[PDB]
Amino acid sequence: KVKVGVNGFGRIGRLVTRAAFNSGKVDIVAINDPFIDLNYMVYMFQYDSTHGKFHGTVKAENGKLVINGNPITIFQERDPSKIKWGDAGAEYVVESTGVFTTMEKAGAHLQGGAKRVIISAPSADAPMFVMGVNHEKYDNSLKIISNASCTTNCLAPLAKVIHDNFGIVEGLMTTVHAITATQKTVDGPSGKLWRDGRGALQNIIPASTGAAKAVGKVIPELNGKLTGMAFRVPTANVSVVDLTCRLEKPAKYDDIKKVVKQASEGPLKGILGYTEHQVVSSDFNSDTHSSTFDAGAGIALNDHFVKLISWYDNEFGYSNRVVDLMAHMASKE
Amino acid sequence: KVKVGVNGFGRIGRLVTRAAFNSGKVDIVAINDPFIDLNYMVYMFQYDSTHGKFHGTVKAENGKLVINGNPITIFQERDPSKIKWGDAGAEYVVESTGVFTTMEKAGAHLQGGAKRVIISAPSADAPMFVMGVNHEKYDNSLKIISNASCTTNCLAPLAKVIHDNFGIVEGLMTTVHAITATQKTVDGPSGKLWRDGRGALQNIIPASTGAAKAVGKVIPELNGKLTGMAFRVPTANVSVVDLTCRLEKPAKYDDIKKVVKQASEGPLKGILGYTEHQVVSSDFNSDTHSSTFDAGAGIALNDHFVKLISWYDNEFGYSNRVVDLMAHMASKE
Amino acid sequence: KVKVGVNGFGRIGRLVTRAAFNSGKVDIVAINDPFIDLNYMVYMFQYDSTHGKFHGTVKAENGKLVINGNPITIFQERDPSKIKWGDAGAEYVVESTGVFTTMEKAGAHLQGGAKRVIISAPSADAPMFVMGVNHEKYDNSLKIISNASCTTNCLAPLAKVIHDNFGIVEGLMTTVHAITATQKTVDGPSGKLWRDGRGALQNIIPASTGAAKAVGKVIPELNGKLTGMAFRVPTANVSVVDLTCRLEKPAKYDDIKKVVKQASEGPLKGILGYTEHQVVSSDFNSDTHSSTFDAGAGIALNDHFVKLISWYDNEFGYSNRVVDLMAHMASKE
Amino acid sequence: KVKVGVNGFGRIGRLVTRAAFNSGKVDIVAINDPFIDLNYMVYMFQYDSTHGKFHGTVKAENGKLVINGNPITIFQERDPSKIKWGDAGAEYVVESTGVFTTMEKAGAHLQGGAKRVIISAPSADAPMFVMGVNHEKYDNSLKIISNASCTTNCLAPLAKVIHDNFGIVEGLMTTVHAITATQKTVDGPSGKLWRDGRGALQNIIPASTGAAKAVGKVIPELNGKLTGMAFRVPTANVSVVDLTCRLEKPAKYDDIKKVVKQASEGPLKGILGYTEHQVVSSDFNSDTHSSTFDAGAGIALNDHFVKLISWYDNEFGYSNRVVDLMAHMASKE
């Protein structure tokens, strides 16, 4: 097995660890949170409104978070150089805080002693390896990897299947995103985007997403052909991606439906999923599937011009994929 | 002035009348609601959660709804043939219930004595005259007219400006619609669409919209080049339309921004509006503008391939446009 | 085991059956829904936004809803006299539609052939037997029983413990109820209460609840000392009951906390539950506990004057209690 | 007139100034916000989701926020000693940030040059003068005053009328509060209360309120007889206070209804308001009334034991009362 440390007990950090203990694929040896105390950690992990209550035992004995009978060392260090990652015997360390995206900031964890650092947020400098798309391009030499973003994680598997099968000359993506921690409850002062400062509960917030531009990085051919936008709506856990694209080769919508289905049942299993049911966002809650294609929703004007709909549990699916990344990395080692 | 009767005191009916007394353009002589009593009518009209409280006096004296000093005759007849529209001295009658879209059903109001019937819901057989697009094609001979739909009312003015200026080879529309009366509070049995039966508060409901196909009717050239889909999200009053289209002639996004601005300040005034501010859905609440273009949100991949964002207050903007339709019809007479 | 038929596939009906197959205590032989088709039934049962997705297999073979390998006969009869309850071999039949509360209406199911009828809605004429309070007063002679209401089911166990231990001279209850099917998404015409017609998402609806007056029926001593009111807020699944009462004998809040805890761990187990954690409504979602006391929230002005807070999953907890009722009734037989 | 400076452009600060320019009672000469730039200030003031769009002109010329033709000096100073209140010619300064509640912190504004400081948050040391209850006890000698809290502002006028008329031996208050800035959109780390860290949209948060204990300060007789609790629900702007109290002298509910009505139409006008309509929270949005009694909702078990319901627009009503306070203070001078 691979021992994994987590930096930050945020939404991503909490769910990365929940997925790890559930899946079982990686054993979480250590968690570092500058501000969250051990007693608070038990509370946060035990109860999640979006994802139900953690099943298993979370307890706080002798400074150790004992989840499912496994004690986790807890660190309270603001700067990653200070964190004793090597002493915690953590092979891989997942940067989740998100304030350390740049590879230099990531390498502070490396001096701690972590053999490799994984970034749960898109990083420009770091190479990005979305699972099921470009994961097999990973090599042992790389020590800092990014898992891109939840939106990109959803988009790319669908893009990989459609682009290979029919070709995509050009594409535009609209994402109906779910509320994030960034969005304030009522109108509030967000200096960067005045758009997000506005309250989440009563508004519909149009924001800019680089996820399509990140898919262009992970899938080389597609680069420069995908850009997008996002709407933040008052939904707690699940979001939907919509790719309006002009194919290179003609395609009937039932052909599009078939190729996705074939991919879902074959190599993109778990990474991609195909549902014909009359599904809604709630049905996709607590999903493992990074991307789930909906067949009914998408409407195609022409064989060439098609709209594709794919629902992703942003918080859960991404976190499960991070765990999968690390398991794959360990196998490559 | 023109005396206008309203059929149905539903969301559309209530706001059509609020707009009428506010704008002042049409005087509402009569309202018919099979199920809503006069005392209830005062309550419903006086307080609207989405649109604030009606300003003015709504009272119930001698069987008359006296709004702003004007008494409105009230009818309780389920079938429109039974309604005494002629006795109420109503020139124009606005079908709002929506169960009488077909022109035959509409003509029952005509026997009542209404010179013309207007349908606030899209009707296949009836000719559809969206204001500011094909309104000038109205002739005195026609007695049954439809104002199409809120979604189509938003789409078409934007489509009229872009298509004329740059051309549109093909287009696909995604609408983040606001909650409707159709959507149940919690999971409920909707036989037609299993999708809508699902609860509005916690879900994101992907539905099918014929509004793009209706724009193709109102603007002839565009017919067969626009189709779409809609997502129902938990937002009370305002929705956003997104047109991803491939232009025929190249266009820089700043050129697109200019032509819309020119149109907004010139002939499509009120019908269309251009805002560069960092707006959100709430800002567009209680708007008169059937369509309001947002410049910041839309992102263009290529000069040819562009995404256009336009926000519409579905309940208010449409209702104001219905009033405008009738005023235009009266002038033509 | 006891074979149980369900009338109505509404929120209560769906969850009564989910609880039955999960708990395992009663085997659901038959379901009758005048309007819901078998194919729709599979959909509704499989996906619930409030309660996650049903775990197990729900399928539709040969006119039978096969849930977890057990086929359920399906009936489409509007009037209960017409339903073949005896042919379905159903011993107990749960009226859930709620339009048949009166015992005469209930007895139509009895002619169908159901030995006993259970009403999931409070019924005046029928005797009401809340589980864990007056359940042991059930006798074989009675054929029509009511399980009261979710609100009463929460209130009474707490009332039973406090009243016995310290006495309650007088009490007033405020319930922050969760959204119901009755509440319209946007302002709508509800003739009975103008209050509920108003939209659920944006409003806070003060309604009147007879649950406190029903507790007075189930616990005789308390009768005439409890009345209440309810606020409908935009929360999907869980509600909280608040009993402000003046004790007869002095009580320190830590004494109140102890007696409830003792009751929860002893005879009122499952029926009542005590939590000291910093819980919120989401934590109580998908709960079996009809009433869960929160120790932290309640504040006592004097030893005599105390405020007690208890959270109940209205949809799930009640449904589980209905199953428990029937199991108890079968044992008594 | 009195020239008033505002410290902090938060929800309270923005609405205190909106009320000031609308009412007209105080002229806002200066606003200080350490983090909010002038351009951002125009945006925040112009658009408010909860309160509609500001009516009038807000512009940014020569470093001055020109609202309705009046230029407001803008300061960017974190510490109040540094702020040039005297240079801004501001007689009264409203502390709104809330981090400077203690009178020492308040006196830093005093050295700036502000003759008097007003605290929009409850302050222990500062004397608290709720309008319409103890306002006439204000004297010129006092330089630091607090306007208590929105919850206390609602409670006390109702308490003043009921206590005087019938007497209140003891009282307990439950407030269904609306979402605040404190409540995070999704589960988040709030160290002080683990309860509030939980997400506002999906939860119902039981918190502790000292407002009842503050009413005991403003009305001396009542001190020690009122305590309470609050539930944070997902409603954007309006909340409801519920006082369950045992009167000293008998009272029929229609007598309670009368005395409140008499008070509303007489001395507690604007401060208190009585409505018999079937009102809901939305109806009270953008209200000036600090407290509005609802007659229908409250239910009385006995003449002695009564439940009283009063709805308050927390953000708007309080802010208007702050303006009224200062006008009263100026008159006393």
Author numbering:
A (entry chain P), B (entry chain O), C (entry chain R), D (entry chain Q): 3 to 335
Reproduce the article's own wording on this structure.
We collected a total of 8,982 single-particle projections for this class of images and identified this enzyme as GAPDH. We were able to refine its cryo-EM structure to a resolution of 3.22 Å. The NAD+-binding site has been documented, where residues R13, I14, D35, R80, S122, and N316 are involved in forming this coenzyme-binding site. Unfortunately, we did not see nucleotides occupying this NAD+-binding site in our cryo-EM structure. The substrate-binding site is located at the interface between the N-terminal and C-terminal domains. Again, our cryo-EM structure suggests that this catalytic site is unoccupied. Residue C152 at the catalytic site is a critical residue for the activity of the enzyme.
Here we report the use of “Build and Retrieve” to define the composition of a raw human brain microsomal lysate. From this sample, we simultaneously identify and solve cryo-EM structures of five different brain enzymes whose functions affect neurotransmitter recycling, iron metabolism, glycolysis, axonal development, energy homeostasis, and retinoic acid biosynthesis. Collectively, the BaR approach was then used to reveal enzyme identities and solve cryo-EM structures of these brain enzymes with resolutions ranging between 2.69 and 3.40 Å. These enzymes were identified as glutamine synthetase (GS), ferritin (FT), dihydropyrimidinase-related protein 2 (DPYSL2), glyceraldehyde 3-phosphate dehydrogenase (GAPDH), and retinaldehyde dehydrogenase 1 (ALDH1A1).
